């Protein structure tokens, strides 16, 4: 298991504009297009992102390209961020994937806001961090994906994805 397989499990693969759990326009593997209510705005962002007139539809190849871009931006973002970088540096390889996952989903700014949990992760207080992370809108809105990430932080193993 690796970061890509893990996020492919969490986000799915959709070749047509769809709406996320939050109501927004997304395509491919969790690639948010816009928070705007306009399907027309969405289609315009899509064309812009792809470099072609897609009309809401992309190829599997295009989804993967987007995905590669997103994962990379997530990693560089953590490493350029003063709050995240030190937590990432302190972690083992598996738990590193978990932070990557949170950042890809919620942005650097959003994860940077989980002050307390980041502090417990840096301190290797696995159980306490898992308990604090669950006290979030994040967990309440998408409990199954949140539980998988949380278990990954708790155990430092791929157990929660192993079935999936």
From Swiss-Prot:
The active site is at 11 (proton donor/acceptor), 20 (proton donor/acceptor). GO terms for biological process: cell wall macromolecule catabolic process; defense response to bacterium; peptidoglycan catabolic process; viral release from host cell by cytolysis. Changing residue 117 to F: 10-fold decrease in enzymatic activity. It is an enzyme of class 3 (hydrolase). Pfam families: Phage_lysozyme (PF00959). Belongs to the glycosyl hydrolase 24 family. This is Endolysin. The lineage of its organism: Viruses, Duplodnaviria, Heunggongvirae, Uroviricota, Caudoviricetes.
């Amino acid at each position: 298991m690796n970061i890509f397989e893990m996020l492919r499990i969490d986000e799915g693969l959709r070749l047509k504009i769809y709406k996320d759990t939050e109501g927004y326009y997304t395509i491919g593997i969790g690639h948010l297009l816009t928070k705007s209510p306009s399907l027309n705005a969405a289609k315009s962002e899509l064309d812009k992102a792809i470099g072609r007139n897609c009309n809401g539809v992309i190829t599997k190849d295009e989804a993967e390209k987007l995905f590669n871009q997103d994962v990379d931006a997530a990693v560089r973002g953590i490493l350029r961020n003063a709050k995240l970088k030190p937590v990432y540096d302190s972690l083992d390889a598996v738990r590193r994937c978990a932070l990557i996952n949170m950042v890809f989903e919620m942005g650097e700014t959003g994860v940077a806001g989980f002050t307390n949990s980041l502090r417990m992760l840096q301190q290797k207080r696995w159980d306490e961090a898992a308990v604090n992370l669950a006290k979030s809108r994040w967990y309440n809105q998408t409990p199954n994906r949140a539980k998988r990430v949380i278990t990954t932080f708790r155990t430092g193993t791929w157990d929660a994805y192993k079935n999936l």
